[PDB]
Amino acid sequence: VSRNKRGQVVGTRGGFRGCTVWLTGLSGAGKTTVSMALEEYLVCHGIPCYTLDGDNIRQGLNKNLGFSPEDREENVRRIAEVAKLFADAGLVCITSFISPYTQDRNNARQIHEGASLPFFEVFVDAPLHVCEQRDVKGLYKKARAGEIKGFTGIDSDYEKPEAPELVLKTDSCDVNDCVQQVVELLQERDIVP
């Protein structure tokens, strides 16, 4: 069946709006918080969606991947292909992964734009020194202590987005305020009516 027919039966608000909102950023930058609140926002506004994150991907589909650069590349590649299917199905697919390599984020975008599906890269941008100081899950302490090897920002590279569709300054917005900025982008791009 065609995408337009999907858009008729997916959700109450007519129109096909499948797409992928690709969050990227350091550990503790707020990706989980923003993605969960974005999901709540969309559902409350009648827009079916689904979130892919480390919790539901790296314990399942990607349980056989570590954090070597090669495994992060394959992690993101698989996530991009799954997000493309969710977008093709008519859902707003929100992805919440560190995704530290420019090439793999751009490969994820190419998979979508080849299939003529919208792809929005959102750089969840908090300074590393802020993420370390808050250390919301204690991970940065263990990384400095050597108990987690190759942790992004400490012993593994994060390549900052140079051309995201949106930059979220999460040391300066509360959850709902950063969500409002994502909603504005989705309205501009005719995802959210």
Add this chain to the structure above:
Amino acid sequence: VSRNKRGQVVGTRGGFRGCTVWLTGLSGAGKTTVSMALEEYLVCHGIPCYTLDGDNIRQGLNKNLGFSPEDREENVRRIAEVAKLFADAGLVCITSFISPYTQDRNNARQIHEGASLPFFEVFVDAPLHVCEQRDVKGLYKKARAGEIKGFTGIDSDYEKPEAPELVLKTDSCDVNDCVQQVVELLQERDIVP
């Protein structure tokens, strides 16, 4: 957000009905035909769904897998995890893969029933001699000729389902008739109202 809230915004017909319809069977048994017509049927009845098949999975997510037993196991494992996400999102996920190994089909089921998501194994059951004689894509000729190695039914095993939820005798039903049997199962299980 919860599954019940998803069921409110996914589709027009209220109620959460996410699940996976897992087709299994020999090449040429009719999996593609039945899955595509099932998708058409559900969409026409206002039920959002999505089909995973060799066309959209083995050229994308699973492009790095062959047909060794080990690669078929990983192929099915990844597909099962993706189907579980689609079911969790509230969609009827139709899968259309040979899935020749009992253990991997049962592992796929366990992934779903652990997450309390319904899983319906449909054995698309045509005799191998029938599939060979029709040879709808010419594949069986190339398998006998040695141009495709380890082709299911010729140089690779198909373990017949012993406990499917439904057996589809596709040498004896036309497309719509086999679809009607799947619809009956989904009605019995409160997926289709």
